[PDB]
Structures are given as structure tokens and as C-alpha cells.
């Protein structure tokens, strides 16, 4: 409109700036302060009813998911060149950072546990069983600095999602099969794809201090004959009925699909 902001006359900025504007701003400030106080108090009362050790509901996450590591730049597509040190540098750095707690130097505090038996903890100490990185052969830092890259044999860590109080029945096992007519050789360095029961159950970040989740490493052996070829690797949980893997709604429920492309 025209003017309506002029300093003269009782009307300034569509009203009275000295009195009307001040009073309405004060009323809005008080109203919104009371609203914010009520919102904060209501959330505080809600948070008083929660437990910091275990979530109130776990029915929305009944089965674990399989996720690969490190996460590629675009949609689980590992694209790298053996001739370019910078193509796979990010993967090497991320793997080194992730596997730092798994080194023998770091996890000396953790205790060794008997294999093959589910290790339940009722005691409040909640010790964490140690996972020796040596189980991942040729996919650890000790064998070579780069985790199989620059040689045509990249390492991909297949980690299983953590769920509090999950007790996988039977013997869990992650099997990986290459969909590229099985031309390359897919190797899982832990025997078969075995995941030991001594790590489960998970008791949460608060209680179960220093947990080291089981890891599975897969090397896609790219032959020197074929270069510039893309291979799809399908991994899923097999040996345990408690862990669901045949689900169509979710493509990552006990299952993962990733593609590796080597260049030069």
C-alpha cells in the first residue's frame, strides 16, 4: 500500500509503534515463552519415563540388517583404479579408522571368551568379548597397509546390525556369491561365514562398554585377465532361523548387495 509507515500521525508501521507495537510484541513474547516452557516441561516429563539403558520398544527392529563397509560414494558402488592411489585412498582411510578399535593393541582390556556358546550377562559389570583382527586374513592392516587394493583384491567389511537383546538361534553365517556368472572368486576369510555366538547378545551402548561386533571380510579376486569389469556380490544370513533374510519390502534385512568395479 501507499505510505502506512509514516512517522507522523498516531499510525506508524500499520499501528502505534510506541504503545501498540510494544504491547503486542510483549504479549507474543510472553505467550511464546509460556508455550516453550510448557513444551520443555512436557518433554522432560516424557523423558523421565524412559530408560537410558534399553529402548522402550524394540518391535520395530526385530531382525538385523546387513551393511557393508566402507560406504562408497554412490549407492554401494565400489569404483577404484589400481594405478591411481587416490581412487581408493578414501576406502583405505575409512577402513583404518574403523578397524582401529579391533587392533590387538587397543582391545587388550577386553576378555577372551569360549567359542560356540551364547554368552549371556546378568551381572552389572557387562564385560565385552574381544574380537581378534587376525580372523580377517589379508583384510587387516598387518598383512599390508592397503586392504587388498592396488592388487586387484579389494576387501569389503560386511557388518551385521546391532540389536539390543538379540539371541540368534543356531549358527549364524554370512554367505557371499558373485552374480557375475561366478567368474571372479569371492573369498570370506572367517571360516565359511561363521559369526560366533559369544558376541551376542548386545546389551546397549550404555551398559555393554567396549562392544566389538562380529565382522565379515570379503575379497573379490579380480583376475589380471579381466579389467574394467563390474561384479555384483550378494550376501545374506543363512544358518540362523531367528535372523530373517527372505523379505521383499526391505532389501537389506539380513541381506546386502554391492558392486565392485576395478579399473586398469
Amino acid at each position: 500500500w501507499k505510505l502506512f509507515i509514516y512517522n507522523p500521525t498516531t499510525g506508524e508501521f500499520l499501528g502505534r509503534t510506541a504503545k501498540s507495537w510494544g504491547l503486542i510484541l510483549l504479549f507474543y513474547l510472553v505467550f511464546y515463552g509460556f508455550l516453550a516452557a510448557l513444551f520443555s516441561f512436557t518433554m522432560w516429563v516424557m523423558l523421565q519415563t524412559l530408560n537410558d539403558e534399553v529402548p522402550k520398544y524394540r518391535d520395530q527392529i526385530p531382525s538385523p540388517g546387513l551393511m557393508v563397509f566402507p560406504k562408497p560414494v554412490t549407492a554401494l558402488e565400489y569404483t577404484f583404479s589400481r594405478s591411481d592411489p587416490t581412487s581408493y585412498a578414501g576406502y583405505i582411510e575409512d577402513l583404518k579408522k574403523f578397524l582401529k578399535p579391533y587392533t590387538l593393541e587397543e582391545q587388550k582390556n577386553l576378555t577372551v571368551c569360549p567359542d560356540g556358546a551364547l554368552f549371556e550377562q546378568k551381572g552389572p559389570v557387562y564385560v565385552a568379548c574381544q574380537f581378534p583382527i587376525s580372523l580377517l586374513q589379508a583384510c587387516s592392516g598387518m598383512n599390508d597397509p592397503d586392504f587388498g587394493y592396488s592388487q586387484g583384491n579389494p576387501c569389503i567389511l560386511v557388518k551385521m546390525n546391532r540389536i539390543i537383546g538379540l539371541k540368534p538361534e543356531g549358527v549364524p553365517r554370512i554367505d557371499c556369491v558373485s552374480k557375475n556368472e561366478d567368474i571372479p572368486n569371492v573369498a570370506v576369510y572367517p571360516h565359511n561365514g561363521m559369526i560366533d555366538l559369544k558376541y551376542f547378545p548386545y546389551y546397549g551402548k550404555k551398559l555393554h562398554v567396549g562392544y566389538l561386533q562380529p565382522l565379515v571380510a570379503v575379497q573379490v579376486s579380480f583376475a589380471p585377465n579381466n579389467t574394467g569389469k563390474e561384479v555384483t556380490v550378494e550376501c545374506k544370513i543363512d544358518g540362523s532361523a531367528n535372523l530373517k533374510s527372505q523379505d521383499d519390502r526391505d532389501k537389506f534385512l539380513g541381506r546386502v548387495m554391492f558392486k565392485i568395479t576395478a579399473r586398469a
Binding site: 516424557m46 546391532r162 551402548k205 562392544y211
Partner: protein
Amino acid sequence: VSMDDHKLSLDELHRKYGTDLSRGLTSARAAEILARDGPNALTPPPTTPEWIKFCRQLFGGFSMLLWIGAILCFLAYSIQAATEEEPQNDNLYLGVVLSAVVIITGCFSYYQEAKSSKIMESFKNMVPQQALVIRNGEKMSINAEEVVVGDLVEVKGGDRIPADLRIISANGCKVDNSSLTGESEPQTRSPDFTNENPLETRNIAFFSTNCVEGTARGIVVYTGDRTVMGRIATLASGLEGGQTPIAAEIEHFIHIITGVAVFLGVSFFILSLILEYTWLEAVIFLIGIIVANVPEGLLATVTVCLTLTAKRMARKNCLVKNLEAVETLGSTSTICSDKTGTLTQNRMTVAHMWFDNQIHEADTTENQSGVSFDKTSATWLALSRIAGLCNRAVFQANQENLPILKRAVAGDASESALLKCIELCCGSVKEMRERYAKIVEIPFNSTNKYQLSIHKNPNTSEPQHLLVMKGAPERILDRCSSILLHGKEQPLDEELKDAFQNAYLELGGLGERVLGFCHLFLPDEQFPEGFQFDTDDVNFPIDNLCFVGLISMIDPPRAAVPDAVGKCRSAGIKVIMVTGDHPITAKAIAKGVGIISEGNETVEDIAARLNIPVSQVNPRDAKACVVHGSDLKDMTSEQLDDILKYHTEIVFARTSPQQKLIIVEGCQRQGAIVAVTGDGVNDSPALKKADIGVAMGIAGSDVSKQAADMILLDDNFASIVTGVEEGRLIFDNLKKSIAYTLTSNIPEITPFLIFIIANIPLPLGTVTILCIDLGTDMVPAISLAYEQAESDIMKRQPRNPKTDKLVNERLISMAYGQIGMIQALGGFFTYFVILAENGFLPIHLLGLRVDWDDRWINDVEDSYGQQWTYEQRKIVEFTCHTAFFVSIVVVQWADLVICKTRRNSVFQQGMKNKILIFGLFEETALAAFLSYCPGMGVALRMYPLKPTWWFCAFPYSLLIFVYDEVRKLIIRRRPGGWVEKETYY
């Protein structure tokens, strides 16, 4: 087509049609002609087919925008189906729901409009046009449909022409030819042939035209659709034109809100495309936001309000031409009403008398004996002679076997009472009038305020001319130099002048209409027996008459007028009394009906009490005034405002028909919506100039009925109180409905803004956005149109159309700043509760947006160390969306309850609106069905709520209810304070 009787003489007129120029055709002949020809009614043309109106409802308003929404949903689903195998069906169900909503809204609006139109059309025929035909010599009132070819009608001022008339005898007849000529200037009708073209000659009536002044008599030549108006394709009445102020407010609000909604939709669409939204998702979000912000249920609310008003007008016998105009009646702040026919029963009888310098009393009805004074008095004989000779009214046909007090009449009320009294205490007026031949008469009009008649003298004295006059007592007395006392004529001196003044004070203070009578014996030498008198020429000496006496007639006020006027004054409406009668009678009637309340006094009254001159009294000491018509003539525009401003109770007297229009302009100049209640022809311009015009349905003239916007068929003055109440109710219901729809907008747009800013997972999606808009803002907002009137609807002052609009800053401030924010807070609290109960504490949610929405990151970690896949956390997010929708229904329950009233509590206005309870129950049932029905997790991504998640929004709903109740309590306890200045919308 030019073949008429305009150029034919009277000799061949009788032969061609077989009807006497004076007597006319007989009743049997008229019945035979009607049976041969048919009725005098135009064939009603079918305007539009019924489902053409249905399509207009379907594609009218925001329904078209919802149509584009549905088409876009279907197109997006088609693209998804063509592209990706087994796509999501959310778009398909969304388009289906949108189309169903559009169809249901359209059919509901069509049904309500059909009901309203049926009520109006059926109730419009309740006022039949009446024609004053002449049959078998006598004249009688007959329905205008029965008019045939051949009969002759007696049309006077204020009556529309029944059909094409070949005028043979006119007395100053002028008609309004605005339909053909295109001007409002009256055209004089005279029997003489003037122009070869019938359209230009002035001896023919063209049907559907209004006779402004004078009366004429003519034979019907063309009837039905054969008339001149029938030939032209354009209809005579046509359609009403003009945009109602409430309609203008609706249009402006719709434009503003649509612009705001489109801007918000486009901004959100661009922001979504920035934040890695797919094109189809962005388009669906665009249409969802745009549909959410617009109030597409507003038009149905307006139609429902109009239909309810039509219901309530029909029961009160109020005929409203345009249902939107009732809101103007509710907004009325001043009512201008005339005395005779509106504030009074218009059934007057002769009550008091004054001649021979003494006040006589006469029995109004059922005397059943000789009159108290002697009928042998020469003065009484002269007065009766003048009353009989000057009267124009004649008795109806075949009513000679019933008492005179029950005999029907054809003239005005005053002439009717004079005729009844003369018949009662005199001889037979028919033979008395036949004894004294009529030569020339000037019909009564408000400009001259008198009626003149010339009669021959067959007595022993033979002046051969009798100049009898009747009119306003004061005006004629100024034209008289002699007065007849006890049969003897003496010059009029000051003693008899002030004796007449005190006598009229005695008569005028009883609320009685009074007329004056005079006669003059014209000399033989001045005018011989073979003399022609012209109405345009003065000829005979109009002045220098001989005064005789006064007739005082009791005219009681209508029964419902006092209470209705009291209610109007208690509603903040200033009722102004404007009339052409004497100030004394006008003031008496004003005090009787309550215009001038007791205790209030005029300047003249104050001066009389204080014995000081009127000029000494300060005008401001009197809050009531009686402005004479003579003073208003020389009164300037500025001075008119002072009286209409300083005085609370104003009475106008002796006002000409144009002075009523002047007063209407003066009242409107002060920014006031005026209502004029006029029934006679003299109120034609005021009725058209007023914001709302009211005409009486029985005694009102045809021109006044045409010019008025509202017609009272029952002649009940309480109908005006009902009309203003229903206009106020329309405004209140519309304002309540608009406020409810606006609050939901903040809960629908806030989640996306917080999503962008705080980078938390999305609290509300498109499907739940549209579920809030359709589920909570259609049936509940419409039901707010069924809300009954508050207790204090008629106790509040009329709304000022300048400062108070349908949507203002206080309504927007309320609905957006306070209620909308509380609703958004409730939704966000339920969001945080669900996300925390599943493992994602509120602090952990900040910054999860990139990782949460990443389809390939399937190890999103919550606060407890668990890792979630993409689908697993998406189920939780969609449960949060469903509970956000549910939480908005719970808070909206409180908003519907608080909207129910504007100042009163819900305790004072009980839950007697069954439509509103139905809306609450249906929206709640819809929310429960959407949450808990199997297959909704695939159809629309809605998942069941755990039982305790329904109560997360309860404290905010209670907060809304309590805050609004205490705010309304502050409004009532402290009126005019800061809270009312800012919150009261």
C-alpha cells in the same frame, strides 16, 4: 409491428371491442373472453438445465484446483507405473480421494443451492400482482392474471401497468419507461394522438412500466406474451444486478488466501527440489501444500448459511430478493421508517371533530345511534358535503348487504375513513355525489399536499361552481380568508387562528391524523355555466377559500412496532421517523411507538417548561428533535449532519418525497448503513438509494415492491428485527468458520520448515498433510455454519464495515500465532514421544536428516547403540506422520469447541449443534480407521498407533480450550480493554 388504436378515435374503440368506455364489459363476458384467450402471464423461459448448474458447482471455486490436484496425482501414478515395476499406489489413492471429495462437495453444494432456489421461487409467488379492472360499471380489485383483451383498468400512481393500455382518459398520468426508452424521467400520458409511431406516441402503455404520478383509465389491447415487452427477447424483469458487500469480502479474502497458498506451495516445491526430492514427490508435495492452505470448504459454508437464512425468512413471511443482502440488514445501523402503513396499522377511522369553534366527539365504530351533535347544523352539512365531494374512493362491487364498517374500499386510508364516517352519519354518498356533478379534480399528491374538486350547485343558490378542497390543515388555512361559523361566514381573525392552533394541539397530541376542509362559492360572472377548467391553468381562484372545520382520525400504531423498535434501539440501531404528516402527530406517534423515549424532551418542550423562548434554549440540551419539512428545504448539507449527529431520537415531519431521499443521503454520509421502510409511491427514490430497502407486502405499492430488496408479506415490523438478527448470525457463522480453517495451516507447513532448519527427520508427509486438510477442515468447518445465534447477538452494537471486516489482522493473529502454534507444538510433541520411545532421543535427531533419508545407509544408529536399516526407521517415521495427523484431530476438537462462540462460553451456548458433534465423531472415526485398518501400511504408509500415543496431544487441546475460555471471560468482564482491542476478531 405498428398496428394499434393510438390514432383511432373513441367512436370505433367501443365497436371494435364491445366494451363501454365507462361501464366496461360485464363479468360473464369477461369470463367468456378469459376462457377463450387465456391468462395474462408471460411464459417463463427455462434459463439453464439442472445439471448445468451441477457442473458449475463441480468446477466452481477451489474445486477446480482440487481437480488439477487429482489429475496430477493420477499422472504421477501413471508415470511411476510406466517407469518402475510395482510402484507405490499412494498417488492413486490420493487422486481417488481428491476426486471423491470434489464430487461430494459439489453435490452437497448443488443440493443446498437447489433447496434455497426452490424456497425462494416458491415463496416469491406468494405476492401476486393485482389489477384494478372495471366491470359492470363498478370497479373491483382482480388478479392481474385474469386481465384479458377488452377490459379497462384503473391504474394510479405507484401501480405497474398490467398490460398494453390504449389510454382514453388520464388525469396527469406519467409513467416510467426505463425499460424501452432507457431513462427514469416520467413521460406524460394523455389520450390525444401525438406521434405516428406507437413507441413515441403518448396515448399507449407498454406493459411492465410504473405509473409515477396521476391515474389513468384505458382498454387492454394486448395481453400475455403478445405485448410489446413480450416481443423483445430481453425479459422485462430481467435479473437482479450488483455485488453484495459480504460477497466482495469473500472474494477479496479468497484472492488473498489463494495467493498466499500458491506462494507457499511454490516455495516449498523449490525447497524440496533443493533437498534432493524427486520431481514426482516435489509435485505431489506442491499440490498437497496448496490444497492444505486454501479453504476449499468455504463456499459450501456460505451456501449452507444462505439456505438456513432462506429457511428462517420463509417462516417469518419475509420475501428476500437476494439472500446475500440479509448481511447488509444485519450490518444496518440506522432505520428510516415512515409513519403511515409501517409504524401504524393503516386502518384509521374518524374519531374527533372541530368546527364552529368547539371540539366534537364522534364514535369511531359501532355507534348504533344518532350522532351526538345535531346533523341539522349548516356547518356540519357543509363539512359532510366537502368530505363526500372531494373523496375519490368508491365502494367495492356487490357489498351492499354487509355493515359499512366492514365494506371494502378502493381509495386511500384517509379517504376510506372519510367515506365510512359520511356513510355512517349522513345519507348515501353515491346519490349525494350523483347530485353534485364532477367537472374537474386534481388528484392528491405529496408535493401539493391537497386535493381539489369542482362541483355544480343545484340548491336554491346557484353559483354553478363549488370549489371544495381537502388537504393538510395548516397549508389550506394559509389560503383562506373566511370561515363559516354556525352556517354564517366571517373573515378569519387572529382569535380563530389561535383557537384552531390550540384545538389542533388537543387533537394532534392524541396520535390522530387530521385533515382540513374548505369550500368556495365561485361567482357566476367570473365563470359562466359553459366554462372549461384546465388542470394546468389556474383559472378558478385556488386561494381565498372559506374554511369549515377539521376531521380528526384515530390511527393506532401496529401491535408489534413498540417491541420491535425497542429491540432495534437495544441492538444499537438508531430508528429515524420520517413522514409527511404534522410535527405534532408525528411526535405523538413517535412517543407512542417508542421512537422518542420517556424523559427525553425537545428544545421546544424545554423552552415551554422553562417559560423562556425557544431561541434561548441551548440546542444540545435536547437529545430528541422534530425537524419540520419547511426548515429542511432551506437547510444546508453541513447543518444536516449536526442534527443526525448530536440528536439520538430524530423525527422528520412534513417531508416531501425528495426530502426523504435527502435525509437518506445525509444519514449515509456519516458512514452508516441505512434501512428505509417505505410502502407508498412517494418512497421510490429512498428505497433505491438505501443500502437495504424494505417494502410492505399488502399495502405497499408495486413500484415500492420492485425497488425494495426485502418485502414483508405479513406486514410485521418484528420481521425487521428478525432480518437484522439473521444478518448478524450469517456474519458470525462465517467468521467462526473462517477462523477454524485458518489454524490448521501452521501445523501443515511448520514440519517442513523445522525439517529444513533443524535437519530432523520429516514429522509430516504429503498424505498426512492432505488427511489433516480433508478430514479435519471440511465437515467440521461446514458444521460451524449451523451454529445457533449467541445470547447477546442482538445486544451488541452494529458492526462498522470499515474497521470490522470478515477477515482482519486479529483473526489472522489469533488463528496463526496462537491456536496454530499450539496445534503445531502438540504434533511435534507426539513426534518426539514416538521417536524417543523407539530409541531415537530428541538430541540425537538433530542432523540425522541426511543419514535418515539415505536409501543406501542401512546402519543408522540410535541413542541406545542399535543400528537401523532404511525401511526399519522409515516405518517409525511414517508412524510419526500418522500420529502427527492424529494429534492434530485431538487439538482441532478443542478448536471447533472454541470457535462455536465469539464472546460467550461453550457452557452458556450448549452443544445443541448436532452437526458439529457429528463432525467431531466422524473425523475421530476417520483418524482411527486410517491408523488401524489393515493394508493402510501399504496403501498410504499409515501404521497403527499404540494406545498411549493418543493422549500425547491432550494437554495442548486442554490448553487451547482453557486459554480461549479465560480470554472470552476477560472479554466479557472487561469490555473495550486491551484484550478486546487485539484478540476479539
